[PDB]
Design a protein around this ligand. Structure first.
Ligand SMILES: *[C@@H]1O[C@H](CO)[C@@H](O[C@@H]2O[C@H](CO)[C@@H](O[C@@H]3O[C@H](CO[C@H]4O[C@H](CO[C@H]5O[C@H](CO)[C@@H](O)[C@H](O)[C@@H]5O[C@H]5O[C@H](CO)[C@@H](O)[C@H](O)[C@@H]5O)[C@@H](O)[C@H](O[C@H]5O[C@H](CO)[C@@H](O)[C@H](O)[C@@H]5O[C@H]5O[C@H](CO)[C@@H](O)[C@H](O)[C@@H]5O)[C@@H]4O)[C@@H](O)[C@H](O[C@H]4O[C@H](CO)[C@@H](O)[C@H](O)[C@@H]4O[C@H]4O[C@H](CO)[C@@H](O)[C@H](O)[C@@H]4O)[C@@H]3O)[C@H](O)[C@H]2NC(C)=O)[C@H](O)[C@H]1NC(C)=O
Ligand SMILES: *[C@@H]1O[C@H](CO)[C@@H](O[C@@H]2O[C@H](CO)[C@@H](O[C@@H]3O[C@H](CO[C@H]4O[C@H](CO[C@H]5O[C@H](CO)[C@@H](O)[C@H](O)[C@@H]5O[C@H]5O[C@H](CO)[C@@H](O)[C@H](O)[C@@H]5O)[C@@H](O)[C@H](O[C@H]5O[C@H](CO)[C@@H](O)[C@H](O)[C@@H]5O[C@H]5O[C@H](CO)[C@@H](O)[C@H](O)[C@@H]5O)[C@@H]4O)[C@@H](O)[C@H](O[C@H]4O[C@H](CO)[C@@H](O)[C@H](O)[C@@H]4O)[C@@H]3O)[C@H](O)[C@H]2NC(C)=O)[C@H](O)[C@H]1NC(C)=O
Ligand SMILES: *[C@@H]1O[C@H](CO)[C@@H](O[C@@H]2O[C@H](CO)[C@@H](O)[C@H](O)[C@H]2NC(C)=O)[C@H](O)[C@H]1NC(C)=O
Ligand SMILES: *[C@@H]1O[C@H](CO)[C@@H](O[C@@H]2O[C@H](CO)[C@@H](O)[C@H](O)[C@H]2NC(C)=O)[C@H](O)[C@H]1NC(C)=O
Ligand SMILES: *[C@@H]1O[C@H](CO)[C@@H](O)[C@H](O)[C@H]1NC(C)=O
Ligand SMILES: *[C@@H]1O[C@H](CO)[C@@H](O)[C@H](O)[C@H]1NC(C)=O
Ligand SMILES: *[C@@H]1O[C@H](CO)[C@@H](O)[C@H](O)[C@H]1NC(C)=O
Ligand SMILES: *[C@@H]1O[C@H](CO)[C@@H](O)[C@H](O)[C@H]1NC(C)=O
Ligand SMILES: *[C@@H]1O[C@H](CO)[C@@H](O)[C@H](O)[C@H]1NC(C)=O
Ligand SMILES: *[C@@H]1O[C@H](CO)[C@@H](O)[C@H](O)[C@H]1NC(C)=O
Ligand SMILES: *[C@@H]1O[C@H](CO)[C@@H](O)[C@H](O)[C@H]1NC(C)=O
Ligand SMILES: *[C@@H]1O[C@H](CO)[C@@H](O)[C@H](O)[C@H]1NC(C)=O
Ligand SMILES: *[C@@H]1O[C@H](CO)[C@@H](O)[C@H](O)[C@H]1NC(C)=O
Ligand SMILES: *[C@@H]1O[C@H](CO)[C@@H](O)[C@H](O)[C@H]1NC(C)=O
Ligand SMILES: *[C@@H]1O[C@H](CO)[C@@H](O)[C@H](O)[C@H]1NC(C)=O
Ligand SMILES: *[C@@H]1O[C@H](CO)[C@@H](O)[C@H](O)[C@H]1NC(C)=O
Ligand SMILES: *[C@@H]1O[C@H](CO)[C@@H](O)[C@H](O)[C@H]1NC(C)=O
Ligand SMILES: *[C@@H]1O[C@H](CO)[C@@H](O)[C@H](O)[C@H]1NC(C)=O
Ligand SMILES: *[C@@H]1O[C@H](CO)[C@@H](O)[C@H](O)[C@H]1NC(C)=O
Ligand SMILES: *[C@@H]1O[C@H](CO)[C@@H](O)[C@H](O)[C@H]1NC(C)=O
Ligand SMILES: [K+]
Ligand SMILES: [K+]
Ligand SMILES: [K+]
Ligand SMILES: [K+]
Lengths: 770, 769
């Protein structure tokens, strides 16, 4: 929109937002004791949030209203209503507060990226990180340095491995991503529809959004073709959980179109599904992504100008524009009879219904107003950022080599990821209190360190190889730190292949020839094809370290020395290189299609051979896994659905059965234990998935010789399939539950009786109406 | 459904309901102190109604749930959840409680029918009647003789004069019917979204429902073709007001189809309009009319069988079935994958959310649990049923014969409506404490009364004429009581003409030849063509008495003797007879169509000459009306919509201007004064309405020589028209406001600027999908 020459947004994936949209605001609170609103209904705490917000908005002029329809809400000076910034961020830490240069409020805790947080398979960790982030956000708000809503979490799935924003997600699985959303959202908001909202969370990006730019296909003009079956079974479940179960107060509509219609103008998505099917809060608001309303016109061409784009997005259910479309074009829309004043008010009322419920109008003694800089210091000092990295690092390959023997006195630390700063933080980060590189972690370890760069991330020069081989020949062991970073994968920048960059694999190869223990760190969010390292017996160990955050280097060193033990697992598939060449990344069809050369997408459908599977991870000990009951027997679909469901809003939320096993540490070292529970079946119509996740857990601190019971509740809805119309359906037939990729424990069950619908999927009558 | 031989419901207008649907239930309250529910969340008074209702429904088995999807909810004995009857009625008084034969709870106050209540043009009267009905319903509830929801009020409009249920309505105008609805609903519920609901009201019948049976077109099979412009401008506003403004907690979906789709299976009506456009309560529930879900299958054929009818109605948003379709076919629908269990639960959760908000779970000290038989007696003793009849009687014709001069000592009281009982009550009534006929009113007046039947209502016999002509010759003055009743106009029985029945006009004609003062009472809800009486100089006076309720004869006699003075006005058009012969009553098009022989419908569009107009009524005095400012000047549409709107949810609810006039009693008797304020314009699309109502009021007790100020707020929304897509739009141009049919005061105003949409009408993408 603010471009200075011709810009084709069908190819360019970065919008050009106006400075008003990008402006940070100095935050403050309305004065309900003595200000102009003090004797008016918005300041009457006996009324509902909706009645208070409706009363406030009735006091505005139209010009005043329109100035508060965008993220940069200019306020209403006449009424003592402050400016209010909707555009906050908290992907993995406070991200878009008004950080000062130094001293108080100059930093916030930088956790690992979500892709690393999820690899821990610890739902309690995601919840605790959300509670700290929520506290830190409220500290910035009380200092005047931010608002009380954030555009987090990202609960899209990492469906295709090239995606430049997969790093922001909990991986490729809808079950894990749903649970991540639930934990992070309920932590941010301070409970499940609580008395006072702590931070308003925003589930994004709804929906069908998982490509930035691949092969020139800009997100801003992408029109993704998705079957109702796959929309219902895969592209929407995280949002169903966020809306129905976590009770999220905001959803962000995506830049892209689906089946012809931009999300923010998509009456089927916002009204028929989110509000009428997914039980979205009656007071919930939809934010457009930043420029997405403008994109309804340019470049989608769904509306013929920006005033018509604004009207179509408001009438579909986009309440707040991240942008300047509503602020600068809603008056023209009104004067051209495209919208009523009441239509424009509806979204601002919803926003302020949530600010009322967060205590914005309730004065200095309301909940969470007493959080200070000292609460940022004391929550950071818990070192949960370090704990998260320790739990989410994944061991892909090991012989005897890790943890390093007491005989290893010196390490050569080599490669582009060894000496780093902000690379540790991925994207959507604020300033950190410190950043510990892998180099620094080893320097702090008390091993002798010999550092050589060796090669840059994307280089075809061997200039630095000799210095690196020299360091390696004189050390007892070699740590090579490489992979990808946000110079390769970012917002508006998908990868065009899924191989290691530059000549990193060539230097690793030469390092493997020296007769020394060789440990490789594969960093970054997306996976790279490590088949050459898998196959090389002289590459002794391989770790995926993701984006490990402010304490990353200490976590990596502590795992490598065995001060801590790994138990993370991959939450995406590491595909072979050819996967990214053989079919278009914009093909949204999950099921294999030999005709189109689609081999099937994600661990659920892929018919090829991963380098390392979804759910792969190794330990510093051995486990023996067994169950008392390998055959859980039969359950009648009609019986399970027709008994009472005390404690659940819906019958299908009940536990169908517990997956239960005995896990014994039969090895030499204490370790945590991570478990994924997969279901597979021939029930329902072909084609059939290989399997799908129905549960997960992390057990803590199994000492050598000790046993712990694993108990994973498998719900009725977790084993439902999806019919060709998008209905969620329980089908009669044979099922198996399996522990991990190797299926160490298998529990069989049968569903008897007739098919039953558990979710009725509404017909899309709006997207193609004439 | 329960028919014993083949029944064609395309022609037959009465459903055959199963006895379970029709069964009255003994009412009781769940025990949240000591019963099985006491330790569960539905008995936790700290939670929301919705959370409490969701928690209750989660305790049920599916078979228990399904037994509570119909109006006759069987309860859940395991949980101590009582049976609960959703089918209550309170059209104009308690109507469907478990009345006992004699003594306490054997009767309730029987007010005039709505059509007579509205003719008073007294919005406070409608509210006060609702408050008394609400209090009497609560007395029956506390006695275990009723529930706490009613299928009232009827806020359809009396669009076509043949309709057998027009009597139940506030007349043909959408503004009046919207105000009636708002006042009666807020009175029933005990406020505007109050803390505790008093009685759950149900706006009915949504939508396009205004024909029973005319020319064998049964309501059960009728598929009414309505433009989006007329659906928005006329057939839905009373429901928009009921939902948005009165905050009604229930809507009843109608028997008929509109534009191919039965109302109860109509996603556009229930979801896109009522829920997504009209701000229906997030906890509100839709009831089908009694048998309506069954009719989605038989006879509409929208669904192929009763299970599919049930599933389509649930998915569209019909929460509760008045009938046995949900109770006896829901399980089949679930087992055939037509609905989920959550789909079936949604409607019962909505019903119980309202029952929780009415204090149903809150025990004997909850609000309204202290109302007893004492409160029926004390509210009845206020005599508001009498006052309503006095205020809603309409004087159509008079030459100073009324009120009767003191020289009249004897009256001949003749005709089929003289000696009556339940005729006074119209329909949807319970037992009354007493019923005063016109004959008893005159016997109580201290006039000497000579009674003669004269003729029966629908008679081809002159056998009683001689005895009536004799009584008339012997008396000083003749009162003829006639018209129509529920033997002519009823549910499942439209009129086939709009003329006086039998030979009543022949006997009046003969009585007009005797050189005595002659007063005719035209009784019943629909109008009959009284042109022969208008034109006969020897018919001295004509009164429209509607259905005037338990005290009706005292109200008529007190008007006629001048103990009270009439001020009511007609709330429907009295059309000439040929109006009911020249175009089909099932044509819903309001705008005149010369090709189809449609002359335009209602006072807003009719291009013919009424016998007596909508808004016509006479007084026992003369009034002089004037205003200081006849030109209120210009208003800019953008300016008016862009200033603040403090105290209003919507800008368009603001007053645009006040219509004000000085009204002086220039005559010799104290009188009330009634006013209709009409607007007319050349703004917006042709064709142009003749006029439409934007306001009304009733001033009280103007003594001779007394002046009062009439002040009627004209809101921005009241003068908005409707475009071809159904949007409510304010148009620039020239407007006139006019006091009454004679336009005694005219105030001009101009709107300037650009058209503005004040209500965006959503596209119907579902009806033809
Ligand atoms: C899956 O992920 C889980 C979640 O992350 C992992 O569980 C976490 O493990 C961490 C690492 O061990 C624990 O971190 C250490 O915490 C202690 C402080 O503990 C106290 O406070 C904790 C936080 O409390 C707040 O948040 C919770 C949870 O949301 C609330 O419930 C509280 O009310 C409180 O809320 C406030 O703040 C929030 C956020 O702003 C707001 O939202 C609220 O409104 C409030 O303002 C709390 O969790 C602890 O509670 C545990 O311990 C209690 C007994 O002490 C016990 O009653 C509780 O039941 C709970 O018990 C369970 O957990 C403990 C956990 O270890 C078990 O032992 C127990 O048996 C039960 O399972 C507690 O109240 C902190 O001091 C540590 O930091 C020091 O040590 C670390 C080591 O890593 C160093 O790096 C630091 O630098 C630091 O060093 C200082 O102190 C040293 C010792 O004194 C000293 O040596 C140094 O010099 C230096 O001064 C850690 O930060 C974490 O508590 C725990 N979280 C939870 C929820 O359990 C889980 O392990 C993981 N894996 C698996 C397999 O599950
Ligand atoms: C348009 O229609 C209007 C509404 O019907 C007409 O106004 C009505 O006129 C009638 C006839 O004159 C009059 O009837 C008399 O009422 C006498 C008792 O009055 C007191 O109580 C009533 C009822 O109170 C309850 O209801 C109202 C709400 O409707 C509520 O606000 C109260 O709190 C109370 O609630 C309780 O019951 C309800 C229902 O069950 C529950 O919901 C609730 O929980 C409670 O349990 C009040 O309305 C009266 O209020 C008037 O007087 C007070 C001050 O005294 C004023 O402050 C108030 O504004 C109002 O004033 C208006 O009316 C009075 C006359 O009453 C005028 O003087 C004044 O100028 C105003 O017009 C009282 O508090 C009752 O004793 C009397 O019965 C006796 O006479 C009859 C014959 O007439 C005999 O048969 C009897 O046996 C008795 O001997 C009679 O019933 C109504 O009170 C009045 N109603 C209202 C709402 O104003 C209006 O005339 C009409 N026409 C025009 C031109 O406007
Ligand atoms: C679930 O997937 C597992 C793993 O592919 C299938 O395993 C086979 O089961 C049969 C017994 O029915 C054995 O004879 C084979 O040896 C098994 N193969 C493996 C790889 O273990 C299982 O059949 C699938 N179950 C369903 C119900 O779909
Ligand atoms: C409002 O309606 C009145 C009719 O009541 C219109 O007044 C008539 O105007 C025409 C001019 O076209 C005259 O021929 C008639 O004599 C008028 N009749 C009466 C009874 O006054 C009036 O023009 C309409 N105004 C608008 C703005 O539509
Ligand atoms: C910006 O790009 C658009 C096309 O996306 C174009 O129409 C417009 O002219 C450009 N603006 C400027 C100032 O170059
Ligand atoms: C709207 O915001 C602009 C700045 O973007 C400001 O100059 C203008 O005064 C605001 N309008 C009103 C009515 O406050
Ligand atoms: C910095 O923060 C600490 C802890 O909340 C506080 O004591 C100190 O007053 C702050 N400094 C200023 C300048 O406010
Ligand atoms: C590490 O990188 C920093 C820049 O962050 C650079 O200044 C420093 O010289 C490098 N350290 C070594 C040992 O080369
Ligand atoms: C690595 O990149 C830096 C920054 O461009 C450059 O100065 C340096 O020469 C490169 N080193 C090698 C070994 O290529
Ligand atoms: C498989 O791909 C081919 C070639 O694009 C296409 O014609 C066919 O519709 C696809 N099948 C499905 C199930 O989408
Ligand atoms: C599953 O295990 C949990 C935890 O022990 C238990 O409370 C629950 O009753 C079990 N559910 C079933 C179906 O066995
Ligand atoms: C009732 O009438 C229907 C047609 O409406 C017919 O199908 C059915 O057989 C009748 N029932 C009986 C028992 O005659
Ligand atoms: C209601 O109570 C009466 C009196 O005990 C009893 O005769 C009748 O069977 C009960 N049930 C119904 C359903 O009316
Ligand atoms: C459902 O209602 C019938 C009566 O119509 C009754 O016999 C039956 O017991 C009820 N079912 C349950 C589960 O209560
Ligand atoms: C009937 O009502 C009166 C209240 O007027 C009360 O005193 C009496 O006890 C009641 N009769 C019975 C038998 O309950
Ligand atoms: C009036 O009708 C009643 C009830 O039909 C009848 O019993 C009575 O005799 C009639 N009165 C006269 C005066 O005919
Ligand atoms: C009027 O109808 C009644 C009842 O059908 C009949 O008994 C009576 O004889 C009729 N009277 C006249 C005058 O037709
Ligand atoms: C007038 O219509 C009624 C039904 O409303 C009918 O009984 C009567 O025969 C009709 N009169 C004539 C003269 O056709
Ligand atoms: C008038 O009626 C005719 C005949 O039914 C019809 O074709 C025409 O469309 C109608 N005109 C309007 C404006 O509806
Ligand atoms: C209109 O009349 C009402 C009722 O008296 C009054 O409150 C209001 O202020 C008046 N408004 C104008 C514009 O005069
Ligand atoms: K492949
Ligand atoms: K009679
Ligand atoms: K006519
Ligand atoms: K105002």
């Amino acid at each position: 929109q603010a471009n200075t020459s011709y810009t084709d947004y069908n190819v360019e994936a970065n919008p050009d937002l106006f400075p008003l949209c990008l402006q940070h605001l100095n935050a403050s609170f309305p004065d309900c004791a003595s200000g102009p609103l003090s004797l008016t209904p918005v300041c009457d705490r006996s009324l509902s949030p909706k009645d208070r917000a409706t009363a406030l908005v009735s006091l505005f002029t139209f010009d005043e209203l329109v100035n508060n329809t965008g993220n940069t809400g200019l306020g209403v000076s006449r009424l003592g209503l402050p400016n209010y910034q909707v555009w906050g961020e908290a992907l993995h830490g406070v991200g878009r507060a008004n950080f000062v240069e130094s001293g108080n409020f100059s930093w916030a805790t930088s956790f690992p990226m979500p892709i690393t947080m999820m690899a821990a398979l610890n739902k309690t960790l995601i919840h605790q990180i959300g509670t700290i982030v929520s506290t830190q956000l409220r500290a910035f708000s009380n200092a005047g340095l931010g608002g009380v809503d954030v555009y987090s979490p990202n609960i899209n799935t990492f469906r295709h491995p090239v995606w430049g924003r997969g790093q922001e997600t909990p991986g490729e699985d809808a079950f894990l991503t749903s649970v991540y959303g639930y934990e992070y959202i309920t932590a941010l908001q301070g409970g499940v529809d609580p008395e006072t909202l702590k931070i308003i969370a925003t589930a994004k990006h709804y929906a069908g959004y998982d490509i930035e730019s691949w092969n020139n296909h800009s997100r801003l003009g992408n029109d993704m073709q998705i079957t109702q079956q796959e929309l219902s079974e895969y592209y929407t479940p995280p949002f169903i959980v966020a809306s129905r179960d976590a009770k999220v107060r905001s959803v962000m509509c995506s830049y892209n179109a689906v089946n012809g219609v931009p999300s923010c103008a998509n009456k089927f998505f916002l009204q028929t599904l989110l509000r009428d099917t997914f039980e979205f809060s009656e007071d919930g608001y939809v934010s457009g992504d930043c420029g997405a309303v403008y994109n309804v016109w340019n470049p989608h061409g769904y509306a013929s100008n920006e005033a018509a784009a604004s009207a179509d997005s408001i009438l579909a259910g986009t309440d707040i524009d991240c942008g300047t479309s509503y602020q600068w074009h809603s008056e023209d829309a009104f004067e051209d009879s495209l919208v009523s004043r009441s239509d424009i008010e509806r979204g601002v009322i919803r926003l302020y219904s949530n600010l009322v419920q967060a205590g914005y109008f309730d004065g200095e003694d309301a909940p969470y107003r007493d959080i200070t800089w000292d609460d940022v210091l004391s929550t950071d000092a818990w070192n949960i950022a370090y704990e998260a990295a320790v739990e989410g690092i994944v061991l892909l390959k090991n012989d005897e080599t890790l943890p390093l023997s007491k005989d290893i006195k010196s390490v050569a630390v080599i490669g582009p990821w060894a000496n780093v700063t902000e690379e540790l933080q991925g994207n959507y980060f604020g300033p950190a209190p410190y950043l510990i590189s892998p180099l620094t972690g080893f320097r702090d370890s008390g091993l002798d360190v010999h550092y050589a760069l060796g090669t840059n991330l994307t280089s075809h020069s061997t200039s630095g190889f000799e210095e690196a081989l020299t360091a390696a020949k004189q050390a007892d062991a070699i740590i090579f730190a490489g992979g990808i970073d946000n110079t390769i994968e970012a917002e508006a920048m998908d990868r065009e292949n899924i191989t290691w960059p530059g000549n990193q694999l060539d230097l690793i190869s030469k390092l493997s020839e020296l007769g020394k223990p060789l440990v490789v760190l594969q960093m970054g969010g997306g996976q790279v094809d490590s088949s050459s390292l898998k196959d090389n017996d002289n590459v002794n160990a391989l770790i995926w370290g993701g984006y490990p955050g402010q304490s990353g280097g200490h976590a990596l060193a502590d795992i490598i020395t065995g001060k801590r033990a790994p138990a993370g697992r991959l939450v995406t598939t590491q595909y072979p290189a050819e996967y990214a060449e053989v079919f278009p990344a914009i093909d949204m069809n999950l099921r294999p299609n030999e005709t189109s050369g689609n081999p099937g997408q994600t661990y659920m459908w892929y018919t090829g051979t991963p380098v390392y599977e979804f759910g792969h991870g190794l330990f510093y000990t051995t486990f023996e896994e067994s169950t008392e009951t390998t055959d859980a027997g039969s359950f009648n679909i009609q019986t399970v659905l027709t008994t009472p469901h005390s404690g659940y809003e819906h019958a299908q939320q009940k536990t169908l059965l517990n997956f239960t096993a005995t896990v014994k540490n039969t090895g030499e070292r204490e370790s945590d234990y991570t478990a994924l529970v997969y279901v597979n079946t021939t029930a329902g119509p072909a084609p059939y998935p290989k399997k799908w996740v129905v549960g997960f857990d992390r057990l803590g601190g199994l000492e050598p010789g000790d046993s712990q019971t694993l108990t994973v509740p498998v719900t009725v809805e977790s084993v439902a399939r999806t019919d060709e119309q998008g209905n969620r359906v329980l089908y009669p037939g044979s099922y198996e539950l399996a522990l991990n990729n190797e299926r160490s424990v298998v529990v069989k069950f049968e569903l008897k009786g007739e098919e039953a619908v558990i979710l009725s999927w509404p017909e899309d009558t709006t997207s193609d109406f004439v």
